[PDB]
Symmetry: D2
Subunit: 250 residues, 4 copies
């Protein structure tokens, strides 16, 4: 029988390429999404046409709130409902936008940025572990530039830093149960859709290895590695997939 994986924010971009790769490797997949229903449903279609009954979608808002624990429990429950098991959780979903220190409210910014990048991954990891020959692991999508952050992205960056803490804390605490917890940290990969083309080339130009961004597929490749049987002693590790960007001084 085929293992199953939850991938959050899996309708588009890196999350999508992660879901695809997991599926190609043999996994059944829960494709989580928030707003991107059309793209999510379309992906499940593609996957299931390849292998029958191997993908479902699951809608949820991962903003922090008093119901987030229930929403995260339900995402994991949805994997068990479809597939009878849940072997892999990928925390990929992420809000990303500036929150300068000097008309969404600040309480909403805090809820979205810290919810998606950190609180939801924690709650998802909690529900994953509680619901548990096997190779169980979590992969968090981190940030190679977590210590060289974007100007005015302090809440986003606080979420990402918290996610490093979670990766490590959960690696430690869940090791006795055979669950591995690891990270994959992009630098510059798929550029924001809203970003103008000049700012895009500015980012590309900073990357030592080839002066270009990572493909989504290259990011997924590192995910696939950490969930595989070639990573069975790896836990609490965060692999940069950044073409050396984090090594470049100002």
């Amino acid at each position: 029988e085929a293992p199953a994986a939850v991938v959050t924010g899996a309708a588009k971009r890196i999350g999508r390429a992660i879901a695809v790769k997991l599926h190609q490797t043999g996994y059944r997949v829960v494709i989580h999404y928030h707003n991107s229903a059309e793209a999510a449903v379309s992906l499940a279609d593609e996957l299931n046409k390849e292998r029958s009954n191997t993908a479902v979608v699951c809608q949820a808002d991962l903003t922090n709130s008093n119901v987030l624990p229930a929403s995260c429990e339900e995402i994991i429950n949805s994997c068990f409902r479809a597939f009878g098991r849940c072997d892999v959780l990928v925390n990929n979903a992420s809000a990303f936008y500036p929150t300068p220190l000097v008309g969404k409210t600040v309480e909403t910014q805090v809820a979205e940025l810290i919810g998606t990048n950190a609180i939801a991954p924690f709650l998802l990891t909690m529900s994953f572990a509680q619901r548990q020959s096997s190779n169980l692991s979590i992969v968090n999508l981190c940030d190679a530039m977590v210590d060289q952050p974007c100007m005015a992205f302090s809440l986003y960056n606080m979420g990402k830093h918290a996610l490093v803490g979670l990766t490590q804390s959960a690696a430690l605490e869940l090791a006795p149960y055979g669950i591995r917890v690891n990270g994959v940290a992009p630098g510059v990969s798929l550029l924001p859709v809203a970003m103008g083309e000049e700012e895009k080339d500015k980012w590309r130009r900073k990357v030592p290895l080839g002066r270009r961004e990572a493909s989504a597929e290259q990011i997924a490749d590192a995910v696939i590695f950490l969930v595989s049987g070639s990573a069975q002693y790896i836990t609490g590790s965060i692999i940069k997939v950044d073409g050396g960007l984090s090594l470049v001084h100002a």
Copy 2:
């Protein structure tokens, strides 16, 4: 004119030492507290006896909520109403208890652990900076030397502290044009809880290479004083471990 500092969680232990040392250095102080009113007030009284009109208290819950931004704005405001200025912010208040992965609800634990250790520091930072829109302005965040070697089953506390490292760095960067520095002090094991059995206290003490003892609160305060001083005027984004070598010790 004497400069002024807000210290959060200043009624007791490390925050108290910090407020006292800042006061001794010449600061006027806002002693923020949550539940420890009597201790906060007894410290304000002690300090006002040293120099009249140099210490006020300010009560607030720093748990994450819809009212937290207003609370933090009001803590900053309190310093201005009291003293005409706000030169130093020390983010010291912190909830600390286990939250294992496998009576409070988890959403409450999130609110308390992430709110005290991380979001309230961010909101305080915004309000501090907004009000400042040869002075020596800075923020010091109380971090954790053991942030990458966490206590078992403290994932939320640890997430909070990690987030605080990110804030320290993101704020250093963003506020540098305003001349506001932002740094941390990262204690290892300090002032152990009076109620912890001495036998449990000694298990921790025995791990510390430098003197096989915990840091005093005053030792933690000494690093804060350095960071706020004119001797640290090019230092920003730096987190100073004050840990007796504990973090260098493998399992």
Copy 3:
């Protein structure tokens, strides 16, 4: 044309496992050795029995000296001589013994062996590899406990820290050449043969994931990943393969 790899200190233990796995993946290999000639040759025998003329041996002392550059140049030359190309360099060879700061070999000899094997030779090999020039990369065998070092092992530890520096400096500088430079950081893997059985279990008990050491093969798996096409955007990354050991406080 199969690609070709150099693995230093490849006669035994982790380096052996690395050469074997590389070979199984389709590489031709240079098995470098210092003292273990008999073991180097029986490995080459085994490998060339699977596939004729795909394994050669190469002897060198990697102690720092006036001749070390020439020796390192020649290790690279041997790969080009045997196989016409050099795709991968694995810096595995390492001296490891205590050098107490407060009070056999002179201190200057200790400096030479510990800093030479763990840092200077890797630098010189890196120079010669890059000079002599597809999916080219280098993988340095690091130390997950580089920041929580063994007591009285300051020279070894300085060497491994230097090797971090080299990993990152060389990733930056050789990215324009398409040469990726990465590391693999074991925590507790194969225990030193000299170690007493009870001390061995003292170390095993520290590891959260399984209370045991990584096998050499598990270390090698991370090496294989980094040299593969599935790591083509990864450079300057050091992957811990430590079972969570570096996460554990005193």
Copy 4:
């Protein structure tokens, strides 16, 4: 009776500022130098005019060699000969120049860059500990950009990384003797004397805090803090003095 300190490379620039501030704080000082004899004795003259018999010079090459240990022993011996004690060691002396991976032989480059930045600090630390109310400590002059290194400076950067490892290893090992071991990490401070003003300004403009370099005194201030009784629990800590430079992305 007044404490005594050894400062390596103390004839000028940051080591001179350190010597001066230690002296102002009441230390007697050994001003080590290599080539800058005139500057060294000019400094000791000023200091001795301030308080007589409180400064001496001490010449030594800190390039790695088989006599380097004797040379480092003699530097420490010199402090005891002049002042009857040695309370503080500041490892400031450093060679700094490029060593491209693709004048001096490589053997010499290795000896100078690794000897000054790491091996001599190790040996001086051994000698300092061996010769030993008190507040004993060592401060190593590190590099805030140790993980975002200058292009083509691999040997220098290897040296500085090793120095991080020594700082940590030695803090651990010497803590039972009550000797603290810490570091101070400039980012951009006094620009190299051969730099033209234009290239100077290029480095200045990178610094968030003030778009300028740290003064020599600003670095010394962090040293004096670490040696002071205000840092009596600090060991194994490296204090960046970089105006935010290491936090700035490419």
